[model samples]
Target chain A: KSHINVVVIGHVDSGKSTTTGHLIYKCGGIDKRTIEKFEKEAAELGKGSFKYAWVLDKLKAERERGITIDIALWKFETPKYQVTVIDAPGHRDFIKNMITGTSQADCAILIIAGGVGEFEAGISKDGQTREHALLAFTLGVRQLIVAVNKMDSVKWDESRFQEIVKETSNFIKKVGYNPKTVPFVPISGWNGDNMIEATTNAPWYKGWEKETKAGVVKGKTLLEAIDAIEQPSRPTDKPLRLPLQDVYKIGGIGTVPVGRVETGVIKPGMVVTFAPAGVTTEVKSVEMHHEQLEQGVPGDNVGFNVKNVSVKEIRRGNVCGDAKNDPPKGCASFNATVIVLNHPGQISAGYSPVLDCHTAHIACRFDELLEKNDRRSGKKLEDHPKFLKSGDAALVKFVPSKPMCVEAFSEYPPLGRFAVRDMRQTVAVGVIKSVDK
Target chain B: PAAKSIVTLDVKPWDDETNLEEMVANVKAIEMEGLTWGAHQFIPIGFGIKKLQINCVVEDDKVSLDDLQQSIEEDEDHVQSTDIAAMQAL
Candidate 1:
């Protein structure tokens, strides 16, 4: 099984958590006895008798609030792939956390419930469905697995399924995802319909696929469809850049800084330099999740105690790199080409859209709207646009309120992309074009 | 831990057949009242037709979402309906 990180995105109450939680359960990630334990506790706590949802929704908010409030990560296996599923919170307030969760995802599973007007409501212009998909693409999630969930609500109607597939694909492609390649899997996360195996719920649920290298793939179960994702090669030998997420004290173990390894590797006794905070330290040992390791490569979320670093010296937004390589650098200003997704009004040069970049939540000011060009042609539309609205793409010069470790998207994929928010909504998505040295 | 109050409202013509240029000017009149107009996208309901769905942010403290919508409607007779939807922050 290959490794992949996938984010489940959909509107609130659209059954994203139920799908992933049940999927993990069906894939042997959770034992039946474990779920029964959770079920018993849930029943005792007045959240009595939720079926598949009992696997996840263990948070007290689900009991008191009746819905999840933050991004939840779960691990599972799907025959051919070991997956880390990011169940993004579907609430409006949780959308910022959703962006952070999705930033680490290689692909997305957009769950749309096909019950009567449910599908229409979620995919409506103002709903979370389009915003999530559009944000995912802008944040560099290339592939999508469109799960037409809750087919049971439509009573396994194949015609309704077909109608939704066509309608959803019409807009899915517009967000820069290839609709032809995205699998529209009919599923009922509440039930076990196509979660792990296929069944004869609807006889007309058939596929017509021509010959291909993957052996004319057609009528695949949701598991098979997810397994089809190509595993991305981790850049283990590139320059080591670990963006610090937190610094902690481990009692007798000294100070431990933790974060996901964005590029290259981290080994014991490696001299590392963390910037902006500006501290050079030695890695005493490495720990990921809970276990100790001698070394860690890209994609690893690791924590390690440092030799000379104090918890006071390192901040969460700082980045670390091997002292040997040209250590990570920070810049006060940068030129970014942003695609405006949703702004209250048009964005002017004076506005400071808060940027979410690799655990660094910093407000960056747009001192200059440098150039405007056709998103596809790259031809200059205007020397400078006074303001950019939704669906407008332009080049803008941004000055971070402070020094930030930013790189061009072409050079470093993880640190390059960012989401722009203003007035409590994602106004645009941008990838760094260049930074002022 | 900071907050900005902005709401996106769906503004529509009483009829789909309203003049496009006139509708644009009508939208501008709303903007003159200190509200910001974002984008005009076709919000597809049943039998898909073009709708003037503009997303805006409340610039002044006095402007509630309802007040913003009412002022926009007061300016243009063609505008039929407007409603606010919860949007995601970046």
Candidate 2:
């Protein structure tokens, strides 16, 4: 199956859920029974207008407030690809959920509210719209499709649309995305215009003048643009790296661990190695969904039963790899190129906080700020500054209190990006540059 | 190899009034039957109750995990619960 994981993200009240719900319905992913149930529930709550939003907003409070709080997974088929869309929460309180959602995305669709001032407020210095985009880019979502939603609210004015595009294009470039490659689609997600097809609602959206590698940024529907997204070739022949998302025992089967295959391939009856614990176990069978397979390659979410392993022997965040060669090593200290996204005031050298990396939540301390520089360029800025504040990027060293399984970004991107959360807020995002044995 | 297959078990007191010393004595009394007893470490598991982690060796031919659980739960009047944390290979 030509399947890819696409994450939908934006600021709160940016019509993310509504847009996704509409897209899912348009793709015929939801059955009539579910739609009927949603409509009936909406009527009972005196919210007849919430029929579409109720599809993804299963939470009652979330539906009533029209905000997403949790990640919702739905599968839909396009002309060229089978997509497993991840609808991520955009509320301020659910940034953690957003990070988890984006961590699994191979590509992303950033929904922006294009109703004049709605775009302005969403892109404010502290708004989640900017934060979500930056976090997604930092986490390796290079391919993006910007859905400038609610174009109907702006009366389909071409000038207003261009204004929104120009403003966001600059910021998107700052987030490390080439402005010409990332396509911006003017859409009215609520009114069902230019969603699955090009519409007369915005005749000015015929095409942009730029000729880039991502195409002319025109003449394609939203779904068409998604299918055009390049699913980058994964490092499948490399070492096997599967971060155990969860571990449990079935009544009949022994210890079974589940997670997405980050790199290489996993097959049945192969000896697997785990990091942190550094234990080896025999894989009895490889399974995904309800079917057993002879092998599981990279990009497949799967679970496998072990022959002589106990659930207590491994934990979430432990990397599972081929026991044949180069088994993952547990590190006590490592160096990272960290960008401080937010802090109360300044992050001193001794700042200690917990980092959320994939499924691993490990407490690490900033041992030292090896070097500081402008986030945009590697220009030498300061050496061991008194303290680093928000928007400051540095080459820092971190030491975890316990053994943690980490890989450099160039070596393994899945386990490299980390979100620094302190006082329950994600203060920074870092990418592992190197590690010492 | 008389090392036996040792498993780490966590036992919690039923309440603050329950005598943990009595529970330990009861476990040690059962040690000679089909299980071998080791030192118990004091573990604080919040909720105003005391937890004790005991390592006990049970020969597979001598006692099954279900049998061991049944034996531990028989003293539920004084013991809150028993959880097997880990198992060592024979």
Candidate 3:
């Protein structure tokens, strides 16, 4: 079976959690015992009807209560792909998780309120709906499914559904999604209608009319739209770049390094170099799930044994790559296309903020403000802007206060995208356009 | 091991004149069944608005992040709103 990382993004009031909870529940993310426990708890709380929403609201409790499960906690098996669902948190300042989460998602589902006035309040009030969509688009979530939830509030009115779709279509297109190609699915997360099964309440909903003529028949259910998403190709031919997530000292296996392979492949017996520390060692073996592997490719989280390397010598924030091939390097300066999300005042040269890049979190100074460009046009507006304010998108050159492992966004996207942190908030996000040798 | 989440949040003020130290004190005054306040720092944003970045450990079953943030914002005079910066399972 294939794997797809699906991120659910929408306004906090748009039933985002309920829809996510419904899917995970329908797909058997929780076991019989857990469901029984949740039911018992909900009944005790006098909220028996909301056990599904409780499924998501109490997800942390479930993880804390259980040790291990038959399947991954957040993942479920669909007909075609084993999907991992991420409920994108809707805090305006918590944009780092959105950046990190969407970067990993192969596809995204944008849920919007469908009831009259409900749609307007969600789309207008906080900008979460627009911001999440733009983040998904800008972070390269190529596939999208727009789910119009709360249809039951409007009694499954066709006109109401169409009205919501029309307004949402305009904004998503502005953010870079082709409205015609994307599916606008109307659903009721509370009633569990048109989610896993087609609802008779909405008889006119048959599927996307555009996809009907494209030779691929789309279905009315959200599950059908999910299975229709195309899988992206793996970057196996690129240079090996694995950022260390955790390092453990195994008595017999020497220093065991663990992380997902972001690019290329890793195999036993290959000489690997750890960046920032700039230490080179021979790869003794590769293992996942406590099992040995001959090779590890992108998306494979493997723990590999290395000869002569100690856990103290290399830790998280270090990058591993083939010793002979480009082997990740430390950056002196890097340029990026940055978007300022929430800043109180102007940002100018020498403004240093902590940068969250891959496994590294280090302060990086804004060495220079290169160009200020229109967010929509990508055309240069000013050659050298003296200062940048909130909502401004510009090209900035950054120099990390400490040596770090970062790559060009065009070359290694996983290592390239980062969140600019200040005031204990994700103030901005950017991708490295180029780096100093 | 107890299943808990380490949550970091930025508690903003209504204006620069509002005291962040008192705001943080008011935020920490929020008590829940499973929530415990931790280390906090005042990180300057701009325009003299220094946001209070606070950390907390919450019991997954006993505390709700949304409810806690709402509780902090209930102090409308000194506080503007609370924003979650990060959360992780521990």
Candidate 4:
């Protein structure tokens, strides 16, 4: 089975972890004994530990406070795929951690609470939801499953679901997420209905399906729907592409750099060049998930042992590749898609925000957001969106404060993604559509 | 209040024979006498006698000795120190 990295995110108390736990349990990844142990431990501690939701809140402070404080990762398996579910904290303070966690996911499951006015009041006039959603998209999670949860709270009303669909569809459209491509599923995490088993209450809904059943709504479930989403596959046939995430100094291994293999394959003794630095070295060994391997293909999170390289020479956010097919050079100017979060006054062309891209954080300025008429709705935004609120999507030109490596989305997507944060909150998310020298 | 002239010093220690403790005491004595010497840049010369360039500031007699003492203490604590051997050589 292939491995899939999935992230569950949403507003506070929206059942991201609970929904994930229920889905994993129903899928048969966790056994009864492990759950019993958790129950016994919770009982001894005199707390409600038996709840499937507690699995994600491993931190003591988070458990006591009943809020996610950081990202929690867990591994589960289905017949078709080995899934790693990442649960990200929903609080505004921990959005940085959420960005870091979401950057790794291939797909995202957004847990939106059901009920007509549930999100209307919570939607800040400033556009927090739109900004966060855009940030996720900017981080390169192209596939999303809007898991409209708490259906029981709304009495399984089809109208309520349709209303949420309408609002979310409009918001997603504004953010440039293709509605036809993204999947929307209604689930009741609390009651465990329409999550794993088909719910009898919602007879009008035909989207529920079991993953194992033959011809069972082929791609109805969140997992299957996301699988249909495109992802970079093994590129053994293509040239080598590697993005350096971090460098580590091992006692015997010397200096080793680790990153996700974007394309092609790398074998021991292959000559590779560290981008930006232009240092050439031969691969001494390749290791993935801590196992020594002869070579690694695209999408493999592999570590490379290089000869005669100093840790100080190589830093995080560097890319390594075959000298023949070198990676993009660090640049100062680029075009991207940005969603504004909270702008105290306005985000003009000269506005500067700390850019969080891949593993690199640098300051950058907004050049321009090519504002055009919404062809479908004919709604015209201001000539220059002086105050870009949270939900508006803009094709913006940016100039980095310092030279840093970035790539165009069409060429190398792993390096093209970026996020912008101001005042401790992620204000925008963008992808490099074009790079200027 | 009269304007004060401040002098800074750059010190680099060379050789193990240099005594930083004694040099620091001398500087403290000068400071006690109402004379001020500040390190502009301090570099380790590897042995002990740090290369020292001092700047002298002439201040108003009305300046409190307590204020001078506090400044010296603060500066001493903030300055980077390598090791006792390096200090001795400087």
Best by DockQ: 3
The lDDT leader among the candidates is 3
- A275-300, model 1: which lDDT tens digit per residue? 87778878888876446778888877
- Model 1: residue A114 alpha-carbon error in angstroms: 2.8
List where candidate 3 sits over 4 angstroms from the true fold.
Answer: A36-73, A91-94, A101-103, A209-217, A248-253, A310-312, B1-90
Q: What TM-score does prediction 2 earn? A: 0.73
Candidate 3 lDDT over residue span A103-167, tens digit each? 37889889998866767877762376677677777777878889999888888888888888899
Q: Which ten residues in a row have the lowest lDDT in candidate 3 chain A?
A: A64-73
Worst 10 residues of 4 chain A by lDDT: A63-72
DockQ of each: 0.01, 0.02, 0.03, 0.02
Off by over 4 Å in 1: A38-71, A153-158, A208-216, A247-256, A277-281, A287-292, A305-314, A373-380, B1-90
**Clash total of candidate 4:** 28
TM-score of each: 0.71, 0.73, 0.77, 0.66
Q: Is candidate 1 or candidate 2 better by TM-score?
A: 2
**lDDT tens per residue, model 4, A367-407:** 67566234233255546565465546667778888767677
Query: Where does candidate 2 clash, by residue pair?
Result: none
The residue-level lDDT of candidate 1 at A321 comes to 90
lDDT of 3: 0.76
Give me the runs in candidate 4 sitting further than 4 Å from their true place. Answer: A31-33, A39-71, A93-104, A116-119, A122-128, A137-142, A162-168, A177-184, A208-238, A245-254, A288-290, A299-301, A349-352, A365-401, B1-90
Give the Å shift of residue A173 in candidate 4: 3.8
